[PDB]
Design a protein around this motif. Structure first.
Motif, PDB file in Angstrom:
ATOM      1  N   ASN A   1      -4.532  -3.937   1.825  1.00  0.00           N
ATOM      2  CA  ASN A   1      -3.236  -3.435   2.265  1.00  0.00           C
ATOM      3  C   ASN A   1      -2.301  -3.377   1.065  1.00  0.00           C
ATOM      4  OD1 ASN A   1      -4.501  -3.646   4.726  1.00  0.00           O
ATOM      5  ND2 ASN A   1      -3.136  -5.219   5.557  1.00  0.00           N
TER       6      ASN A   1
ATOM      7  N   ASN B   1       0.757  -1.254   0.000  1.00  0.00           N
ATOM      8  CA  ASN B   1       0.000   0.000   0.000  1.00  0.00           C
ATOM      9  C   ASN B   1       0.794   1.316   0.000  1.00  0.00           C
ATOM     10  OD1 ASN B   1      -3.365   0.133   0.961  1.00  0.00           O
ATOM     11  ND2 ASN B   1      -2.180   1.975   0.462  1.00  0.00           N
ATOM     12  N   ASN B   2       1.876   1.385   0.769  1.00  0.00           N
ATOM     13  CA  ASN B   2       2.572   2.655   0.971  1.00  0.00           C
ATOM     14  C   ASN B   2       3.917   2.800   0.249  1.00  0.00           C
ATOM     15  OD1 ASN B   2       4.738   1.586   2.338  1.00  0.00           O
ATOM     16  ND2 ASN B   2       4.029   2.173   4.380  1.00  0.00           N
TER      17      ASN B   2
ATOM     18  N   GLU C   1      10.860   2.003  -1.268  1.00  0.00           N
ATOM     19  CA  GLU C   1      10.493   2.923  -0.205  1.00  0.00           C
ATOM     20  C   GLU C   1      11.100   4.290  -0.499  1.00  0.00           C
ATOM     21  OE1 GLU C   1      11.843   3.193   4.325  1.00  0.00           O
ATOM     22  OE2 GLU C   1      10.727   1.334   3.971  1.00  0.00           O
TER      23      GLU C   1
HETATM   24  C1  LIG Z   1       4.502   0.865   4.752  1.00  0.00           C
HETATM   25  O1  LIG Z   1       3.439  -0.068   4.726  1.00  0.00           O
HETATM   26  C2  LIG Z   1       3.704  -1.385   5.166  1.00  0.00           C
HETATM   27  C3  LIG Z   1       2.369  -2.119   5.250  1.00  0.00           C
HETATM   28  O2  LIG Z   1       1.566  -1.785   4.137  1.00  0.00           O
HETATM   29  C4  LIG Z   1       4.412  -1.407   6.516  1.00  0.00           C
HETATM   30  O3  LIG Z   1       4.752  -2.733   6.861  1.00  0.00           O
HETATM   31  C5  LIG Z   1       5.666  -0.551   6.471  1.00  0.00           C
HETATM   32  O4  LIG Z   1       6.276  -0.532   7.741  1.00  0.00           O
HETATM   33  C6  LIG Z   1       5.293   0.862   6.054  1.00  0.00           C
HETATM   34  N1  LIG Z   1       6.486   1.676   5.915  1.00  0.00           N
HETATM   35  C7  LIG Z   1       6.642   2.798   6.612  1.00  0.00           C
HETATM   36  C8  LIG Z   1       7.876   3.603   6.322  1.00  0.00           C
HETATM   37  O5  LIG Z   1       5.831   3.179   7.456  1.00  0.00           O
END
Ligand SMILES: *[C@@H]1O[C@H](CO)[C@@H](O)[C@H](O)[C@H]1NC(C)=O
Ligand SMILES: *[C@@H]1O[C@H](CO)[C@@H](O[C@@H]2O[C@H](CO)[C@@H](O)[C@H](O)[C@H]2NC(C)=O)[C@H](O)[C@H]1NC(C)=O
Ligand SMILES: *[C@@H]1O[C@H](CO)[C@@H](O[C@@H]2O[C@H](CO)[C@@H](O)[C@H](O)[C@H]2NC(C)=O)[C@H](O)[C@H]1NC(C)=O
Ligand SMILES: *[C@@H]1O[C@H](CO)[C@@H](O)[C@H](O)[C@H]1NC(C)=O
Ligand SMILES: *[C@@H]1O[C@H](CO)[C@@H](O)[C@H](O)[C@H]1NC(C)=O
Ligand SMILES: *[C@@H]1O[C@H](CO)[C@@H](O)[C@H](O)[C@H]1NC(C)=O
Ligand SMILES: *[C@@H]1O[C@H](CO)[C@@H](O)[C@H](O)[C@H]1NC(C)=O
Ligand SMILES: *[C@@H]1O[C@H](CO)[C@@H](O)[C@H](O)[C@H]1NC(C)=O
Ligand SMILES: *[C@@H]1O[C@H](CO)[C@@H](O)[C@H](O)[C@H]1NC(C)=O
Ligand SMILES: *[C@@H]1O[C@H](CO)[C@@H](O)[C@H](O)[C@H]1NC(C)=O
Ligand SMILES: *[C@@H]1O[C@H](CO)[C@@H](O)[C@H](O)[C@H]1NC(C)=O
Ligand SMILES: [Zn+2]
Lengths: 901, 146
Positions: free
Chosen positions: A196, A174-175, A219
Motif C-alpha cells: 500500500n 500508494n496514491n 494529495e
Molecule cells: C489514497 O490512498 C490512501 C491509501 O493508500 C487512502 O487512505 C486515501 O483515502 C486515498 N485518497 C483518495 C483521494 O482516494
C-alpha cells in the motif's frame, strides 16, 4: 559552554567535506502511538578528508537513531579506522563521532545511518502541514530547511558552503504524489512489504547546499506548460484550487519570467523542470528551493472572481523574486549568512525586473522606490540602525543567523544594488553579473567576488567611468549605516552632505570608518533637461555649476531616486520646483514628483525645513492623476491625520484634502464610466483606489453617494456582489459608517458566511467604521469570543476599532478594562501589537497620565511579550506631545488658508 | 425575367450592460457582435451577390463587476442594438444605395469608414462597438432597405 574541542564551537571544522548523499525517508501521515506523527529515514553521506583528525562532526537535530550509532565504510581502497564512542551534542546541533585511530586526506569515507524524527507541525525541517478542505483535516509532508533545519531531517553538513550532490527517495502512501528538487528517476514502484506504499526515486541533483533541499508528499495536483526549450513548468496546488484556473496566472507568467532571467544572466536555467507549489498555511511568504519553490497560497494563486489587482502584483513579484534566486543564490551561493544581504537584496531588486517583463504595461520598476527605498530609509535614519556588511566571525548561533533577515539586508540591499546597476549603466552590470555566475557556478562566494567581476568589466571598457574603484565606492554604502542628505544652495552652487537622522537631537554612537561620508552618484535635471552628471567625493563640502541657477530656473537632483540619498534645496529652488509642479507638472518625472513630497516631509521631521514647506509640496496635487505622488502625500500626511484628527485642525485639513481630490475623483468618475470599468494600467488602478478612499474618508458627497448606492445594491441582492474587489475595502468601510445596524448586521452576516480570507479581512475592518457608539462597543464584545472572531484576528480587530475616532476611547477603556482576563487567559497573542495600535494617538499630557496609570495599575501582573511595547508606547507619546505643541499653530493656519475657494 | 441574387446580412449584436455606481444603465464595450459566416470564420463579410438587405438581430444581457453576462437586462437596464450613422456618407436607416463592393468587418484594418453600434436604452444612446465597412463605389451591387 567550554569551547576548546571542535564540538563546543558553532562552526563545522574544515577537516572533512561532503561529496554526495544517498537519502531515503518515509513520512507517516497518520497519527501513531499516543497520536504522534513520525517520519523514518536512512542516509549514506560520503565525505572526503582534507586534514587528518580522530573525530567526525556532522549536524543533527532532534533525531533518534538505532540505539553503535553510525556505520563507517571505506570506499573500496580506503582503510577504515574503528569507532570508539558516538556522542550527541544537542546545543551545537552536532552528531559527534569519536574514533579509535585516525583518517588521512585523499581517501573518501562513507557513513551509513538510519533514524527517525518527529514529523511535527513547526513549519521547519521535515514537517507536516494540516489543512481543512471541505470539512476534512488533510495532512501533507513538506520541507523548510531555511537557514538550518536540514539536520532536523537527516544527518548532514548543514552549512551553505559545503555544497554536495543528493540522491533522494520518498517511500509514501500508494496514491499520493512525491515531489523533490529533481524529476522522478522512473515511475513509482510498489514497496517490497506493505504494497500500500509506493517508492519514488529522484534523479541526482546538481551540487547544492542543503537548505535548498525540498521533498513533498501530498494529495496535490498541477497545471503545466512546456517552454520552447524543453524545460517543464508545473504549478502545484490543492486539487480544487487547480480545478478553477486559480493557479493559471501563476503559470501564465512563470514562463516569461524564467526566460527573462535566463537572458539577464546570460545563463541557461540549470534544471530540467521548475515546480512551484502552493501551500495553504506556509508562514515565510515563499522559499526558493531549487527546482521546487514553495509559496503561501495567497502569494501564488489568483482568483479573477474574488481577488483585487493588488493580489495580481503580489503574485508576479514574488514568483519573480523566487525564480531570481534560481541562479543568484542557488547556482552561485554566498559563503555565509553574514552576506545574506547581497543574496536577498539582489533578488529584492530583480523582482521588479523579472516582474516588469511579464507585465510590460504596468511599469513596476518604479514601485521599488516607495515600496523599498523610502520604506527602508525610515529605519536606516535612526542611530539604532546597522550596516549591511557584518563580519563573519560575528555570526554563529542559529539565532544570529536569523537576525540576518532585517528589512535592511533586503530593502537597503536592493536600493544599494539598484543604484550600483545604475551608475555602471545596466549592460555593463550584466556583463560582470554574468562573468560572476559562470566563474563561480556550483561553488561558494563572498560579496567581494561580485565587486571584483564588476571591476573586471569596467576595467575592460573605456566608455563609462567612476571616481574610485567599484569596491571603494560600494564600501561607503555597505560598511557604514545610514545615508546622507544632499543639500544644495542653488544661488552659489555649493553642496553639502550629512548623515541623515530625523531625530535632530541624537546620540549617534556607532563609530564609523569614513566619518559618515559617502561617494554619491548624483544625476540631476535642470528645467526638464537632463544635466550631465556629478560625483560627491567622500568629502563634506563641494561645488559645481551644475547646481547653480538663474532668476527663473530650477534644479532637481536624484532623478528616479536611483540614489540612496535624500535631497534638500534652498528655500528658493523648492519654491521654483513648486511653481513648476503647479503649471506643467509633466516636466518632472513621476518618481520625482513623489520624491519631492517624501523628502520634504522627512526633512520637516528633521527640522531641516519648516513643516509648512513640506505642506506646499502637496498643493500641486489638484492636477495630479498618478498613484505615486498621491501615495507619497498620504503616507507622510497620515501622521497629521492622527495627531489632529480629534482636534481643531481636522476641520480645515479635511476640507483641504477634499479640495485636492475632487478633480481626481472627477477624472476617474469619467475615465471609468461612472465606476463601471476599472482602468487597465496597474498603477492607474492603484490610483483610483486611493482616489476614492481619500474622497470618501474626507467627506466628498458623490463618493459617499457611490459607496452607499453600491452597498444598497448589494443588500438588495446578496450572494451577487456588485462591488469590484478593488473598491470593496473603501465602499464597505463607508457604507457602514454612513448607515445604521441594517448594514452593519448585514456585513456581519456576510462576514460569518465568508470563507475566503480576503473578504473576511475587508469586512472585519469595515465593521469597525460604524459611527454608532453602541455598535462599536458591541463589536468590542464579540472581539473576545473565539466562537465569532478568531483570537489571531482579535488584536487586529480591536485597534482597527481604535482607528475609528469615535471608537478610540471605547477601545482604550475596553483594552485597559479587560487586561486581566486577557493575560490571565489568552496570555502567541501579540499583546504588543495591541497596546501600540491603541495608544497610537496619545499626544496630550493627560493621555500620558492615563497611559502611565495603566502601567502602574496592571503592574503586579506584568506585560512581558511586549513590555518594551508599553514602555516604548510611553516614549512615542512624549514625542507626540512635543511635536504637537510645536506644530499645531502653524499646521492649523496653513490648512485654514489653503482650503478657501 | 432575369433572376437576381439577394443576400440578407443577418448581423447579430449581443449587447451587454451593467448598472453603474450611481445606478445608471451604462453599456459595456464588451458586447459581442458577430457577422454571417463566410469561407473564413466571421470577423469579415463581403456582399457577393446582386443586391443585399441588412437586418440587425439584437439580444441583451447584464453583468456585475465580474463582467460575466448571464441574467438578461431587466430594467432601467433593458436596451436594444442600433447601428448609428458613424463616419460613413450613408446609412441603413430606411429612406437605396448602390456600390461596386461592400464589406463589413470587425477589424479596423483595411477600412474606409465605420458605423457605431450603440445600445438604445431608455433615454440614452451609448456607443459600444464599431462596425467597419470596406466599400468601393459603383453600380453593380445594390442595397435594398427593410
Ligand atoms: C489514497 O490512498 C490512501 C491509501 O493508500 C487512502 O487512505 C486515501 O483515502 C486515498 N485518497 C483518495 C483521494 O482516494
Ligand atoms: C525614470 O523612470 C521613468 C518611469 O517612471 C522612465 O520612464 C519610462 O522610460 C522607459 C525607458 O526607461 C520608457 O520606455 C517608458 O516609455 C517610460 N515610461 C513612462 C510611463 O513614461 C524614465 O526612463 C526614467 N527617466 C530617466 C531620466 O532616467
Ligand atoms: C460574448 O460571447 C461570449 C461567448 O462566446 C460570452 O462569454 C462566455 O459566456 C458564457 C455565458 O454566457 C460563459 O459561461 C463563458 O465562460 C464566457 N466565455 C468567455 C470567453 O468569457 C459573453 O458573455 C458574451 N458577451 C455578452 C455581452 O453577451
Ligand atoms: C548518487 O547517484 C549517482 C548516480 O546518479 C552516483 O554517481 C553517486 O555516487 C551517488 N551518491 C552516493 C552517495 O551513492
Ligand atoms: C546510492 O543509491 C544508488 C541508486 O540510487 C545506488 O546505486 C548506490 O548503491 C547507493 N550508494 C550507496 C553508498 O549505497
Ligand atoms: C526519541 O527519543 C525520545 C527519548 O528522549 C522519545 O521520547 C521520543 O518518542 C523519540 N522521538 C521520536 C520522534 O521517535
Ligand atoms: C568554496 O568555493 C571555493 C572557491 O571560492 C572552493 O575553492 C572551495 O573548495 C569551496 N568550499 C567548500 C566548503 O565547498
Ligand atoms: C493567461 O493567458 C491566457 C492566454 O495565454 C488567457 O486566456 C488567460 O485569461 C490568462 N490567465 C489569467 C488568469 O489572466
Ligand atoms: C549568452 O548570451 C550571449 C549573447 O549575449 C551568447 O553569445 C552566449 O552564447 C550565451 N551563453 C550561453 C551559455 O548560452
Ligand atoms: C507640458 O510639458 C510637456 C513636457 O514636459 C509637453 O510635452 C507638453 O506639450 C506641455 N503642455 C503644454 C500645455 O505646454
Ligand atoms: C454618470 O453619472 C453622472 C452623475 O450622476 C451623470 O450626469 C451621467 O449622465 C452618468 N453617465 C451615464 C448615465 O452614462
Ligand atoms: Zn529571497
Amino acid at each position: 559552554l567550554d569551547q576548546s574541542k571542535p564540538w563546543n564551537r558553532y562552526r563545522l571544522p574544515t577537516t572533512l567535506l561532503p561529496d554526495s548523499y544517498n537519502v531515503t525517508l518515509r513520512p507517516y501521515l497518520t497519527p501513531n502511538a499516543d497520536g504522534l506523527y513520525i517520519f523514518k529515514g536512512k542516509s549514506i553521506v560520503r565525505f572526503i578528508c582534507q586534514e587528518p583528525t580522530d573525530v567526525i562532526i556532522i549536524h543533527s537535530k532532534k533525531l533518534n537513531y538505532t540505539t553503535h550509532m553510525v556505520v563507517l565504510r571505506g570506499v573500496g581502497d580506503s582503510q577504515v579506522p574503528e569507532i570508539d564512542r558516538t556522542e550527541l551534542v544537542e546545543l551545537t546541533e552536532y552528531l559527534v563521532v569519536h574514533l579509535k585511530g585516525s583518517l588521512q586526506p585523499g581517501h573518501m569515507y562513507e557513513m551509513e545511518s538510519e533514524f527517525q524524527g518527529e514529523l511535527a507541525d513547526d513549519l521547519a525541517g521535515f514537517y507536516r502541514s494540516e489543512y481543512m478542505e471541505g470539512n476534512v483535516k488533510k495532512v501533507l509532508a513538506t520541507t523548510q530547511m531555511q537557514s538550518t533545519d536540514a539536520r532536523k531531517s537527516f544527518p548532514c553538513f548543514d552549512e551553505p558552503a559545503m555544497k554536495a550532490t543528493f540522491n533522494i527517495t520518498l517511500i509514501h502512501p500508494n496514491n499520493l504524489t512525491a515531489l523533490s528538487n529533481m524529476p522522478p528517476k522512473g515511475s513509482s514502484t510498489p514497496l517490497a512489504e506493505d504494497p500500500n506504499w509506493s517508492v519514488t526515486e529522484f534523479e541526482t541533483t546538481p551540487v547544492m547546499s542543503t537548505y535548498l533541499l525540498a521533498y513533498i508528499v501530498s494529495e496535490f495536483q498541477s497545471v503545466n506548460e512546456t517552454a520552447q526549450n524543453g524545460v517543464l513548468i508545473r504549478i502545484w496546488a490543492r486539487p480544487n484550487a487547480i480545478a478553477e484556473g486559480h493557479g493559471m496566472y501563476a503559470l501564465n507568467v512563470t514562463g516569461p519570467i524564467l526566460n527573462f532571467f535566463a537572458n539577464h544572466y546570460n545563463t541557461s536555467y540549470p534544471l530540467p523542470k521548475s515546480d512551484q507549489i502552493a501551500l495553504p498555511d506556509f508562514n515565510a511568504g515563499a522559499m526558493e528551493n531549487w527546482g521546487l519553490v514553495t509559496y503561501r497560497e495567497n502569494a501564488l494563486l489568483f482568483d479573477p472572481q474574488s481577488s483585487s489587482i493588488s493580489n495580481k502584483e503580489r503574485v508576479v513579484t514574488v514568483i519573480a523574486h523566487e525564480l531570481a534566486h534560481q541562479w543568484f543564490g542557488n547556482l552561485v551561493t554566498l559563503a555565509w549568512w553574514n552576506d545574506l544581504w547581497l543574496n536577498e537584496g539582489f533578488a529584492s531588486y530583480v523582482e521588479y525586473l523579472g516582474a516588469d517583463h511579464a507585465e510590460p504595461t504596468w511599469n513596476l520598476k518604479d514601485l521599488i522606490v516607495p515600496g523599498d527605498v523610502y520604506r527602508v530609509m525610515a529605519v536606516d535614519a535612526l542611530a539604532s540602525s546597522h550596516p549591511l556588511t557584518t563580519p563573519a566571525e560575528e555570526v554563529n548561533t542559529p539565532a544570529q543567523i536569523s537576525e540576518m533577515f532585517d528589512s535592511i539586508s533586503y530593502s537597503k540591499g536592493a536600493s544599494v544594488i539598484r543604484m550600483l546597476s545604475n551608475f555602471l549603466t545596466e549592460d555593463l552590470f550584466k556583463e560582470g553579473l554574468a562573468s560572476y555566475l559562470h566563474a563561480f557556478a556550483y561553488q561558494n562566494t563572498t560579496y567581494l567576488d561580485l565587486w571584483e567581476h564588476l571591476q573586471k568589466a569596467v576595467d575592460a571598457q573605456t566608455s563609462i567611468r567612476l571616481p574610485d574603484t567599484v569596491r571603494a565606492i560600494m564600501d561607503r554604502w555597505t560598511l557604514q549605516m545610514g545615508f546622507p542628505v544632499i543639500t544644495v544652495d542653488t544661488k552659489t552652487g555649493n553642496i553639502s552632505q550629512k548623515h541623515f537622522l530625523l531625530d535632530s537631537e541624537s546620540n549617534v554612537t556607532r563609530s564609523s570608518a569614513f566619518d559618515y561620508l559617502w561617494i554619491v552618484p548624483i544625476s540631476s535635471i535642470k528645467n526638464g533637461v537632463m544635466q550631465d552628471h556629478y560625483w560627491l567625493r567622500d568629502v563634506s563640502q563641494a561645488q559645481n555649476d551644475l547646481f547653480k541657477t538663474a532668476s527663473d530656473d530650477w534644479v532637481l537632483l536624484n532623478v528616479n531616486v536611483t540614489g540612496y540619498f535624500q535631497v534638500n534645496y534652498d528655500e528658493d529652488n523648492w519654491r521654483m520646483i513648486q511653481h513648476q509642479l503647479q503649471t506643467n507638472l509633466s516636466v518632472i518625472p513621476v518618481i520625482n514628483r513623489a520624491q519631492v513630497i517624501y523628502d520634504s516631509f522627512n526633512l520637516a521631521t528633521a527640522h531641516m525645513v519648516p513643516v509648512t514647506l513640506a505642506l506646499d509640496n502637496t498643493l500641486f496635487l489638484n492636477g495630479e492623476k498618478e498613484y505615486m505622488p498621491w501615495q507619497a502625500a498620504l503616507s507622510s500626511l497620515s501622521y497629521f491625520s492622527l495627531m489632529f484628527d480629534r482636534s481643531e485642525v481636522y476641520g480645515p485639513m479635511k476640507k483641504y484634502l477634499r479640495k485636492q481630490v475632487e478633480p481626481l475623483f472627477q477624472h476617474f468618475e469619467t475615465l471609468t464610466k461612472n465606476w463601471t470599468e476599472r482602468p487597465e494600467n496597474l498603477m492607474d488602478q492603484y490610483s483610483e483606489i486611493n482616489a476614492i478612499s481619500t474622497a470618501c474618508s474626507n467627506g466628498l458627497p458623490q463618493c459617499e453617494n457611490l459607496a452607499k448606492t453600491l452597498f444598497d445594491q448589494w443588500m438588495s441582492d446578496p450572494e451577487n456582489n456588485p462591488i469590484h474587489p478593488n473598491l470593496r475595502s473603501t465602499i464597505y468601510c463607508n457604507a457602514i459608517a454612513q448607515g445604521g445596524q441594517d448594514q452593519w448586521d448585514f456585513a456581519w452576516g456576510q462576514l460569518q458566511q465568508a470563507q475566503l480570507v480576503n473578504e473576511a479581512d475587508k469586512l472585519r475592518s469595515a465593521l469597525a467604521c460604524s459611527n454608532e457608539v453602541w455598535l462599536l462597543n458591541r463589536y468590542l464584545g464579540y472581539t473576545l469570543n473565539p466562537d465569532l472572531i478568531r483570537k489571531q484576528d482579535a488584536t487586529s480587530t480591536i485597534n482597527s476599532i481604535a482607528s475609528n475616532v469615535i471608537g478610540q476611547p471605547l477601545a482604550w477603556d475596553f483594552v485597559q478594562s479587560n487586561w486581566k482576563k486577557l493575560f490571565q487567559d489568552y496570555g502567541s497573542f501579540s499583546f504588543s501589537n495591541l497596546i501600540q495600535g491603541v495608544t497610537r494617538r496619545f499626544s496630550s499630557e493627560f493621555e500620558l497620565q492615563q497611559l502611565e496609570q495603566f502601567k502602574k495599575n496592571n503592574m503586579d501582573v506584568g506585560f512581558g511579550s511586549g513590555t518594551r511595547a508599553l514602555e516604548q508606547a510611553l516614549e512615542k507619546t512624549k514625542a507626540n506631545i512635543k511635536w504637537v505643541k510645536e506644530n499645531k499653530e502653524v499646521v492649523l493656519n496653513w490648512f485654514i488658508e489653503h482650503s478657501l475657494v | 425575367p432575369s433572376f437576381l441574387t439577394h443576400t440578407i446580412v443577418n448581423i447579430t449584436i449581443g449587447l451587454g450592460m451593467k448598472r453603474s455606481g450611481y445606478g445608471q444603465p451604462i453599456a459595456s464595450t464588451l458586447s459581442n457582435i458577430t457577422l454571417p459566416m463566410q469561407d473564413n470564420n466571421t470577423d469579415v463579410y463581403c456582399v457577393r451577390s446582386d443586391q443585399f438587405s441588412v437586418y440587425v438581430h439584437s439580444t441583451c444581457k447584464s453583468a456585475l463587476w465580474d463582467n460575466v453576462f448571464k441574467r438578461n437586462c431587466t430594467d432601467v437596464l433593458d436596451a436594444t442594438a442600433v447601428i448609428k450613422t458613424g463616419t460613413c456618407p450613408f446609412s441603413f436607416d430606411k429612406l437605396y444605395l448602390t456600390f461596386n463592393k461592400f464589406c463589413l468587418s470587425l477589424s479596423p484594418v483595411g477600412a474606409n469608414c465605420k458605423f457605431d453600434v450603440a445600445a438604445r436604452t431608455r433615454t440614452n444612446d451609448q456607443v459600444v462597438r464599431s462596425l467597419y465597412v470596406i466599400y468601393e463605389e459603383g453600380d453593380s451591387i445594390v442595397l435594398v432597405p427593410r
